[PDB]
Every structure is written in C-alpha cells, then in structure tokens.
Amino acid sequence: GSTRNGRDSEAKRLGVKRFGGESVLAGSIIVRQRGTKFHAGANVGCGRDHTLFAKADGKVKFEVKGPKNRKFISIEAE
Amino acid sequence: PKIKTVRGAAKRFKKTGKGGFKHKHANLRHILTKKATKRKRHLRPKAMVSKGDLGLVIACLPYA
Amino acid sequence: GIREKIKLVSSAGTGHFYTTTKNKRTKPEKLELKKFDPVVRQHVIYKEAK
Amino acid sequence: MATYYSNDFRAGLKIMLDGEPYAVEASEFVKPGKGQAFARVKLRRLLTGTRVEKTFKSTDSAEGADVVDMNLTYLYNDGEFWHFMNNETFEQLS
RNA sequence: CCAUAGGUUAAUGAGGCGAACCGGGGGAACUGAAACAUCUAAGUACCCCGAGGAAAAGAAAUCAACCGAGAUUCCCCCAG
RNA sequence: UUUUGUAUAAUGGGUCAGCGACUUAUAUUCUGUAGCAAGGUUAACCGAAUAGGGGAGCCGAAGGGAAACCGAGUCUUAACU
RNA sequence: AGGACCGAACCGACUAAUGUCGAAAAAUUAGCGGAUGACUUGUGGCUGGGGGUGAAAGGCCAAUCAAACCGGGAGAUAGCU
RNA sequence: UGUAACGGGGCUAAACCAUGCACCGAAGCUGCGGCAGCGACGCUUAUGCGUUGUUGGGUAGGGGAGCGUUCUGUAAGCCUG
RNA sequence: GUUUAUUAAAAACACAGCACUGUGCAAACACGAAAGUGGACGUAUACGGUGUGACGCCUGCCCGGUGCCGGGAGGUUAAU
RNA sequence: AAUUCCUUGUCGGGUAAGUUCCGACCUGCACGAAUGGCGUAAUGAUGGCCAGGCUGUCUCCACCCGAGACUCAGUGAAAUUGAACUCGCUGUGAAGAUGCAGUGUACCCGCGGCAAGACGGAAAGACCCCGUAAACCUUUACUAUAGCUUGACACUGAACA
RNA sequence: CUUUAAUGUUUGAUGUUCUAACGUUGACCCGUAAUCCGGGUUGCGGACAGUGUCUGGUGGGUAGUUUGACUGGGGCGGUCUCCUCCUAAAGAGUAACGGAGGAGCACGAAGGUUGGCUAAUCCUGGUCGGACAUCAGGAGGUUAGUGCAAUGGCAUAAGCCAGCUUGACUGCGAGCGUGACGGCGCGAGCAGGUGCGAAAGCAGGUCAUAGUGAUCCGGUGGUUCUGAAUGGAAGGGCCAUC
C-alpha cells in the first residue's frame, strides 16, 4: 500500500555544551535550548534562542534558586 | 602542452600572500529583502577557502 | 505572496532606500517611517515607493 | 506559477491552455498493464462554454487561471455594461 | 541585302600519371560537455579543382602611442 | 577471479614454447639531490657547434584592495577600542 | 470458349519420417498444389543504401538486412566485464 | 535413497549433579639457537657492542631495500678453439 | 492467384467490383538542387491517391473534437 | 460468436458418457452497418465436429526381409579437457558433495548396452533488472529542416480611371 | 465622440487599355540528313507568371535527441526541501516505503519601550435570556492563553490592556555553537544617529523552533573606482536591490 509518515528534521544539536566548572571565555555558548529550561544567572546572558552565553571568562556552576527550583546558570569568576 | 586554467575559477578566487585563496560569499545576489541585515553584513566581505576544499581550487587553477 | 514588497525611499538628498513588505489590499495607506540614512548620518523620514 | 499534472486534478480545477480557460467537469484516470497512464478528461470551455473532450496523457497539462467565482450584486446598467458589487469587500466589477 | 550563326582547312596549345607539402570550392559524425540541443570534436577526416619546386602572403587606406616604429613569412617569448 | 562469504556444482584455462598490459611528449605541484644564492636560469638563434656568446624573458625578494590608489602596511568604515 | 477439368515434363513447397559433428550451411524419400496462364524459362539490359524493390513478409537487395558490403574518420565511447 | 536426533563402536556408568586432586591438549607461554625493524643508551665512531627495552598474521593501499634480463660508456681492456 | 529464399501458405496480401477524392493538360503526382523525364505520344468513359473487397439484401443517427472545404466583417499578427 | 470475463452460462440435438461441434435463448464484461453489417451456390495442401469404409494407431505386440549397429582387415575424424589414484550413504558446507565428516561397500582391466548424475556439451541468458548504452518506429514530446504557402524588394514598364 | 465637404492629403486597394522586359512544352523558316538546341519572323499571354533574398504560416515528409531517482525485483501507487514529537538505548548524533502531525506565512502592530492587569470551567443570584451573551459574588487555580503544527518555555509573565512610538537603524564585532564544504545560528561590547522611561535601563523585529533556493545571465537606483590615442560616454566593477 502506501505510507503517510517519514518526515522529520535536521536534529538541532541542542543541550549543554560547557558543563560545570569548566572555564569559558566570555561570549561562549553554554546551553543551546528550546525554551528557558535553564535560566540565566550571574554573569551569564540569555540570547534570542534561550542560549545562555557566558559573559566573563570564568567557570560555570548550575544552581536552583527562588521558589520554583529552576536550574540556574551562573559564572564563578576566575 | 601547458595546463589550461579553468577560467571560471579564475574569476571567483584570488591568491593571498600565504598561499590561501579569497572568495566572495554566496548568498548576496538576489532575494535579499527577506534576509536580515546581520546576514547582509557578514556575507559582504571576503572569505577564505577552507582546508577541506582547498585542494580542488589548486588543481583547477595552477598558474594563479 | 499576497504581501508584496515595497521600497522606502529616503526624503533626504540621496537615494538610499530601505526595502520591506506591505500587504496593500488590507492597509493601503503609505508608510511614513522615520529611519536612519547612512549617507546623511541623520534620521530622516522615509516614504514608500515601488 | 501553478502547473498541474493530469494525474492530479479532480473536478473544478480550472486550467489554462491554448489561450482559453477551461473548467474540468470530471476526469477518469486509467492506466493499464503494459501501457502508460492517461486521463480521459471531460472539460468545459469557460468563455464560449459548450463542452470539450480532451484525453490527456499522464504528462503534461496546463497552468491554472485567476478564475474567482464570488458572489456579486447586480445594481446598475448603462449603455452596454453591467456593474456589480461584492457584499463582502465592496470592490468594483464591470 | 550587308553581316553574323554554322561548315572547312591550317597553325599552335592542352589532355594522362604522380607519395607528401601547397592555395581554393564543398564539408561530416562519433566524441567531450560525466544526459543534450548552444558549443566542442573541427574547418578535422573526406571529396573536387589548381599550380610550383616550394607554394600562398607581400610593399600600409599596417600598427602605435603622442614618443615612435617601417613589406610578407617563420622560430622563441609575451601567455594559459 | 569476483565476493558478505567459494572444495564449491560461480568465472577462466587441453598442455607446451614464443609474444602479451602503467608508456611517451610537454606543462604543473610536492619529495629527494646537486649547483649557485637576494639572487637563480636562459629560449629561439649565432656558433671550427653536447664549449662560448645570447638575459628576450621567467620565477623570487611586498603586500592590501573590485579598482583607482596606498605601501610594511593596506582594505573595511563617517572613524576605528 | 475458359486465371475450365484430370494428369507427366516444367514450376512449387502442404504433411510425415529420416537427417540435424548431415550425402546437403534446408536436402532426401513416400505422398501433395498449380500445370494455356495474374504461367514458366534462356540471354542481355535497368533501378542502390535512409536508397532500390515489394499481389506487404519489415520480406528481399551475392549463404549478411528495422537500414547491405568495403575502405576511412578510428586506438569512436564503455561510470561495464 | 540407508541405520541416520552420542561422529562411530559401544556404555547402566563410559549418564547427571556435587567435591577433590592428577594428566592430555595450540603455531599461546617458557626454554635453546638464529633473523629483522624501531626506541633508548653508553662509550665509540665513518658506527658497531657483553649490551638492553620491545616489536615482526595481513587484503585494498602507502613506505623502504634489492635481484635478474637486453643494450651504451669504462672496453682495441679482460675471458675464450 | 501472391507471401515471410532457410521454423508461419493462413482467416493475411491481391482481386474483379464499389465509393470518396485530386487532376482542364506545360494536369495532379513521382524521380531529380536543375535541365529533363515518367504519367502519356494518354486527355475526365482519363489518370493519381485512399478505403472497401465477387454476388444478393443493404448501408441508420451524430459536424461537438480533429482534419478537410468554403467565407470574409471584425480582433490578433511578419519582413518593410 | 475468430468477439463472452464470470462460464464447462442455461436449454435442445448427437454419445453409455461431449469444457469441443450443431441449434436456440439473450444477462452483447466489451457485435454492428464500406477500418463495412448479415446471408451466400462454387472453390480451399484452410479451422472445428460427426458418420461409413479402412486398418499394428491401439488392446499388445509377434515374426520375416534388407541397410547399419557387432567381429575382422585397411584408412581414419570431432565436440571436449585445471589436474585426478573419478564408490554408496547420512550429515556439514557459497545453503542439492566422486573429493569434507562419520560410516558402509568394493580384487586388477576390458567389451556390448541404457542414460539417473557429473548443477554433462554447444551458445560472455534472448526472459528480468541495470548502463545518465545503441538502433529503428510512433506522435497533439522538444528543437530544427526539405517541401508547400503568404507578403515586401529585385528582374519590372507605359496610359488613364 | 459622431456625421459632412473643401484642399496639400500619406497613400495603398483594384481594373481596364497597351507593348517593349518576360513566358510559350503554338505555326512557319534556317542552321540541318535532327519530333534536341539556337537564331529569325508571327501569333497568343504579359508586367502577370516565374525566380533570387528576407519574411509569417504549415510541416514526423525528414533528421538530431530527451523521456529522473529511491523501491524489500521492476512497473504501478507513494515519496523527493523545511519544521515538531517518538523510535533514539538519560551528552550530541542515529536508519527503514518506522509510528504521528505541520510549513512554502502572517503583522507597520501582532514590532519597541514605559505603566498597569490575571486566566479555563463549573456554582448561585439576576429583565427579556435558553445548555451557553452581559452583570454580580463564590469555588477553582493556569485544567487558560500564546497570529498557525508539535515540543520546550512563560506570573518578573513571553499571556491581556493602555499611552508614546519606529532599534523591523547604519558601520563593525571579541568570543563560541554547528555543518565535508557552500553555509547557518548565538552574541556582550564599539562608533554614529534615534525611540521609550523621572531614572536605573531596555530596544539592531515578533515566546523560541518551519514560512525557503546556489551560480550564471539580465533589469533599476547610487557611487567618476576603471573607462582600449586623449576628452567624454558606452560597457564593466563596487553598493543597494529585482
């Protein structure tokens, strides 16, 4: 007979690129993600694609803050 | 007989001072108004031919 | 397709132009935007043309 | 551009070949073992419309027409012409 | 009617062969384009005519760059 | 030989002797090597001629730019941190 | 009289067997069809390659035919063996 | 097609499970002799070694080092009735 | 009667007849760059083409489509 | 039905029995009127069917006569061929074994026969797919072109309406 | 516009007459012993026909050619780029003619900013008024919304509303992300010029992720950058674009 599926897309290569304590030079993408699964914290910016880019050549560190426990991404400064 | 140059590659590449090649980027001839001006700034200057497709350029223009 | 493309021409002395789109058969009044003119280095009014 | 192949269109799909618009009334798509496919299409002329019968192959067929059949309101007569108005958008028509 | 046309007679010349080169008249397709039609192959193969020991071109209605060079042909560069 | 894999019942060869398949030309790039070295080398041609003349040229010492133009800088830009 | 009839020569080729490294690159044997005609035959002409000829089968054109043979382009091209 | 569902004879342990030591068994490992690559080294050298460390299956494929054949110079030399 | 010389002799091809159609003669048409020939030393009771296939009884409706024939008002349209 | 799928349609004839033949019906998948429809005497090396006569076609083969085959003398081929000291079997295996495993059987070597196997011989499968293969053929495929056809200029001028 | 007439009208459209080009495959005469040819007369055609060049039409009569790939053999049917989820084995990636759906846009506000606001659906009470309109209160909690499929996200709202607005701005861009490459994505900061806000600040489009096509050829605008003797120009180039 016939089929109606067989269609997908270029896998977007998302996820975290730089993990925990791992020195990142300013402007380095850390998390490439759909929505704000991981939120931007200290010294880390958020782009127009919810890519949290580093902003200060330092470390990383994820956390949980407020009263929603949203992994948060900060940048220890070394 | 001496090697003839591919004449179309002669008009699209130019040798730089350390063996590399410069080429004009390829998206900036038409439907431009749907492109953002961030793409229409980065496509405007000259690029360098990558390390992968550098051997294909050398073979098709030996004198330049 | 329907939303055709227009050409905002600068009201300064030069001929710099922005190009954009406009659905003409819903909102047919012309665009009178105020954009940056890089020849004058000022921020003069632009106006729709074809 | 809206090009059509003859194995595609069902009925009412307005096509445009040989300088005249055509409506398709019906089309029977057949293809037999050891032959190719053809569609014996029962068309309809649109400008002088009586009927026309074409038996297209599987390839090719025609461009479409700008062929809108919308509701118009007869409201006026003058000399020859007859003017009309849309009750949805109020565009002129002569 | 003159005259031409034709016929006659004499004189002189050509005719055919020949491997390549050489000038002219005509002139492919396979192929390559990773298909193909523009294009290429290629004015090539091939065909025909014509001469010579060589032949054709050859004494600027040529170039040049404002300074100049001085017919034509051929080899090496310019120059893939 | 070809293949994922052949004793294969897949190919090929009756045997013997002889012949039988990466060449040649000219450009081009890298490797070795020899010469000379910010220089290196001539092509036709001339030549009592694989000598010697001949430097016409060619590549290299400077790049940037589409180009004019500028020059250890240049382009981009109204200007570059 | 007759594209009349039966039937030898002459012309043909319906069936069967044999033959199918044959006696023969299509024949033999036993029967079979036409046999005064749109017949058959000898000699010599004529028509030619996308052309001839064809009571038409794409049959025939020197044991070759959906485009002969020979020579040349030519060592065409072969992503295949 | 023939026993044809231990490989077979045959087995009531020569079957199964447990536990125990023996032995067989490879081109593995060790022994003994030779060979080659590569890396270190010491002290030597135009490079070798009591050395020492290791390494050495191979198709497509890349790298290295050779043998032999015909012919040219060395060669009117040398070998040869 | 003819046919696939060399696996098919038939219901295929041909046929007398039939009808449509072209052709007024320097004919239509065929062969040929052209001259010229065939048609034909014929001339519409003649020739070419196409379909059908003795004879008997017959041959119905459809001009939308496609071809053909005729018409020229109008629209479109080449070189110039 | 030279046409009918279903289907060996259903009915009748013929036969002890008939998917064929003949008649008929009509539910004509999908006849049909000069790409002719339906009849048609004659004719056919034409297609189907039935009957008489006739028989080795057959039940079911028997015997005889000749030419080979067989032996002998003479001459003397061929396709074929990796090499062979070239068994059965059951299993394994590039999946159908003379060759491997287990096992059985078999003294060495001819001759006359028969062909089940050697995936026997002959023909680089014709079917099937594939090649950006080839040829012819078709047409409302694409692009051209001969021929036909239209008009303008040329050969080509003079008078009026 | 629509008729009428005068003139120079641009002229074509045809339609008789004529003979001298031209035709004659009409008779006669000569070359000439020749149903060829040539000339000479004469008759009939006659500026027609015919031919050359250019040109529109028709043109399988003829020639060169094309006629896709995947595919559980091939044809047929389906499919071919992009986005979302699963398969996908907790980094990324991952196939099948595997299981499901979507895109070939929309918007000058649906973008920017500042200021505020909080849903869905039931429940009761209430004029017409019902299962359901508007009003009021409660329960409820984001089961709502998000220009559009799915997933992730969203209360500081990215959801709803209002004012002012054009940053849907030009030149750059450290640094990474992701592709074999062409490319694609993110981006603090820098200069110029603006918007909104008292200000701190935010703003180089939109909640993110589809909404798309390389070159060549050519079109338009700008810029003396080149401009075949020179001066211009043409044509190229660059820039904006189609």
Nucleic strand J contact set for D 42-61 (CB, < 7 Å): 54-55
Strand A72-73 versus strand A39-40 pairing type? parallel
Topology classification of domain C1-50: Rubrerythrin, domain 2 (2.20.28)
Tell me D60's DSSP state: -
From CA B6, how far away is CA D72, in angstroms rounded? Answer: 63
CB atoms within 10 A of CB D43: 19
The C-alpha atoms of residue B25 and residue B47 are separated, in whole angstroms, by 7
Helix/strand/coil for C29: coil
DSSP state of B9: H
Protein-to-nucleotide distance from the CA of B64 to the C1' of F52, whole angstroms: 37
Please tell me whether any atom of strand J lies within 7 Å of the Cβ of D73: no
Chains B and C touch (3+ CB pairs under 8 A): yes
User: Is D44 within 8 Å of D22 (Cβ atoms)?
Assistant: yes
Task: Give dist(CA A6, CA D48) in Å, integer.
Answer: 46
* CA pseudo-torsion sign B35, B39, B41, B43: negative
Token pair of B42, please?
A: 């980065």
Q: Which residue from B minimizes the CA distance to C18?
A: B33
Which chains are adjacent to chain A, needing at least 3 Cβ pairs under 8 Å? Answer: none
Sequence ranges of the domains in chain C: 1-50
What residues does D21 pair with on adjacent strands? D16
> Which technique was used to obtain these atomic coordinates?
cryo-EM
Best residue in B30, B32, B33 to probe C by mutation, most C CBs within 10 Å?
B33
Among D70, B30, D35, B49, residue whose Cα is nearest residue C19: B30
The integer distance in angstroms from the CA atom of A57 to the C1' atom of K137 is 58
Interface of C with B (CB under 8 A): 5, 19-21
The CA–CA distances, whole Å, from D87 to C16, C21, C25, D75, D77 equal: 43, 28, 16, 12, 18
Domain parsing of chain B, residue ranges:
1-64
Q: Is the link from the previous residue into B53 a cis peptide, with omega within 30 of 0?
A: no
Instruction: List strands edge to edge, sheet with A44-46.
Output: A15-16, A29-32, A52-54, A44-46
Yes or no: say if D59 and D5 are a contact pair by the CB < 8 Å rule. Answer: yes
Only one residue has tokens 């003409």, namely C24
C-alpha pair distances (Å), B6 with each of A6, A76, B9, B19, B26? 42, 55, 6, 18, 19
- B35 contact residues in C (CB cutoff 8 A): none
Tell me the sheet residues that pair with A46.
A52
Broken C–N links (> 2.5 Å) in chain D, after residues: none
How far does the CA of D88 sit from the C1' of K131, in Å? 32
| Phi, psi values for residue A40, rounded to 5° | -75, 135
Instruction: Report CA(B55)–C1'(K71) in Å, whole number.
Output: 37
- Residues of B in Cβ contact (< 8 Å) with C19: 32-33
From residues 4-63 of B, list those within 7 angstroms of strand F by Cβ: 14, 16-17, 22, 45-46, 62-63
